[PDB]
Write an enzyme that holds these catalytic residues in place. Structure first.
Site, short mmCIF file in Angstrom:
data_model
loop_
_atom_site.label_atom_id
_atom_site.label_comp_id
_atom_site.label_asym_id
_atom_site.label_seq_id
_atom_site.Cartn_x
_atom_site.Cartn_y
_atom_site.Cartn_z
N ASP A 35 0.82 -1.13 -0.06
CA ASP A 35 -0.04 0.01 0.03
C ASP A 35 0.75 1.54 0.04
O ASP A 35 1.27 1.96 1.09
CB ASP A 35 -1.08 0.17 1.32
CG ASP A 35 -1.88 1.09 1.23
OD1 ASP A 35 -2.09 1.85 0.36
OD2 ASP A 35 -2.72 1.24 2.34
N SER A 199 -1.33 16.18 -11.32
CA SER A 199 -1.41 15.89 -12.73
C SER A 199 -1.61 17.24 -13.67
O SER A 199 -2.48 18.17 -13.05
CB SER A 199 -2.54 14.88 -12.68
OG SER A 199 -3.17 14.28 -13.98
#
Ligand code: U1H
Length: 330
Positions: A35, A199
């Site tokens: 994770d 992004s």
């Protein structure tokens, strides 16, 4: 040194990914969920409440000659989905595909939440986010990657998740045969302890690219792609019959649909998530309504680039002095 292991989807939907980990002496192999969104290495164990164990493989610290109880240390973690686990701590030898760490903190669960008990394929977690999020009290512990960092040939770890197929987690090296084109690197903020990046924008299917800064984390421990409501509404508007269901708790669409793709920006580079990656099957057994893989992060507080997004790319978690993230098409 290097380490290499195969990661496998737990089911036909790719709800999670498991990777074999060797713990203790002699080796006790557990399939852990790597994770990059958390930082606790925790396992189902001989100490877990019997009723909370349902088919998982357990770690028995008393059967490991290298296991040592970390005196007074306890842990308790709560995840973004509402799940939780907690217990005591040991130090033991941990290995992932040939890469070994002596004295790694292995967090032994005394109690887990229902959704951990219900997943018989997941024997615990292996946190790969920054060690500042580790919950061990009173003395915080380091992650597996943190402990191995200096010994590695290069201070990196790569995630190559498969779509309905096995994939790879590599430590200490970049496999140049595992991707097409070049790796584009982007800045990372370690202020929230996550692999947090920005992004450069998105496109829906064959649509025009929208240049917009989307801040979020690269999280292998989250199934779906969580993006801002505006971006998500633009995506689902391209699917005939799709809508946001209050009862289901998210966007749903007719199972007979052919979903459009979704592109995200990594600098001037682009990662294309194919439409099939966004289909998560019927909302309930037998239903003709399917759940979407792209959901709104409005209730979360942060955007998440989970497995839906990451499995479309070769992902480099660069633990150099100034950490960065690398993304390449594959
Ligand atoms: N994001 C961490 C995480 C990973 C797995 C699970 C589940 F599904 F196994 F309970 C919950 C939370």
């Amino acid at each position: 040194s290097t380490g290499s292991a195969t990661t496998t989807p737990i089911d036909s939907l790719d709800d999670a990914y498991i990777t074999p980990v060797q713990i203790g002496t002699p080796a006790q192999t557990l399939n852990l969920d790597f994770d990059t969104g958390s930082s606790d290495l925790w396992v189902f164990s001989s100490e877990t409440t019997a009723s909370e164990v349902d088919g998982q493989t357990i770690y028995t610290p008393s059967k490991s000659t290298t296991a040592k109880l970390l005196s007074g240390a306890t842990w308790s973690i709560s995840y973004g989905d509402g799940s939780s686990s907690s217990g005591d701590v040991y130090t033991d030898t941990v290995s992932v595909g040939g890469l070994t760490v002596t004295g790694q903190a292995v967090e032994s669960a005394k109690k887990v939440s229902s959704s951990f008990t219900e997943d018989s394929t997941i024997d615990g977690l292996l946190g790969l986010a920054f060690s500042t999020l580790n919950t061990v009290s009173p003395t915080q512990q380091k992650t597996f990657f943190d402990n191995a960092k200096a010994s590695l040939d290069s201070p990196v770890f790569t995630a190559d998740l498969g779509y309905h197929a096995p994939g790879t987690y590599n430590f200490g090296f970049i496999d140049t045969t595992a991707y097409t084109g070049s790796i584009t690197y982007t800045a990372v903020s370690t202020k929230q302890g996550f692999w947090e990046w920005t992004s450069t924008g998105y496109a829906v299917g064959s649509g025009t690219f929208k240049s917009t800064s989307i801040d979020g984390i690269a999280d292998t421990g989250t199934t779906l792609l969580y993006l801002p409501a505006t971006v998500v509404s633009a995506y689902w508007a391209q699917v005939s019959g799709a809508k946001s269901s209050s009862s289901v708790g998210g966007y749903v669409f007719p199972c007979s649909a052919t979903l459009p793709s979704f592109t995200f920006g990594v600098g001037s580079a682009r990662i294309v998530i194919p439409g099939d990656y966004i289909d998560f099957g019927p909302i309930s057994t037998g239903s003709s309504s399917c759940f979407g893989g792209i959901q709104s992060s409005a209730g979360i507080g942060i955007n998440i680039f989970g497995d839906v997004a990451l499995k479309a790319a070769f992902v480099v978690f660069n633990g150099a002095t100034t950490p960065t993230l690398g993304f390449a098409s594959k």
